[PDB]
Amino acid sequence: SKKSKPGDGKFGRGVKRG
Partner RNA sequence: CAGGCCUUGACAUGCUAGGGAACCCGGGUGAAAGCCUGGGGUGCCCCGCGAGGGGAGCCCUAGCACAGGUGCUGCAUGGCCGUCGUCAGCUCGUGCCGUGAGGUGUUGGGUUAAGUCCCGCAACGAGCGCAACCCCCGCCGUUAGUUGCCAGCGGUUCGGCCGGGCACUCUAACGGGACUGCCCGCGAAAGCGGGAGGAAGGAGGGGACGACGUCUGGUCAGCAUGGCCCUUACGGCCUGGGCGACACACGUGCUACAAUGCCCACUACAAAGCGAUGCCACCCGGCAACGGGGAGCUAAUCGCAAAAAGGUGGGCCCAGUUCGGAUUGGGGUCUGCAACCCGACCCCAUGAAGCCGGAAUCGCUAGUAAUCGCGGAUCAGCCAUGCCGCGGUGAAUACG
Binding residues for RNA, per CB under 7 A?
1-5, 12-18
User: With binding defined as CB under 8 A, does residue 10 bind another protein?
Assistant: no
Q: How many CB atoms lie within 10 A of CB 15?
A: 13
User: With binding defined as CB under 5 A, does residue 18 bind Mg ion?
Assistant: yes
User: With binding defined as CB under 8 A, does residue 7 bind another protein?
Assistant: yes
User: With binding defined as CB under 8 A, does residue 1 bind another protein?
Assistant: no
User: DSSP of the chain, one letter per residue?
Assistant: -EEEEEE-SSTT-ESB--
* Contacts for 10 with CB less than 8 Å, ≥ 6 apart: 1
Footprint on this chain of another protein (rule: CB under 8 A): 5-7
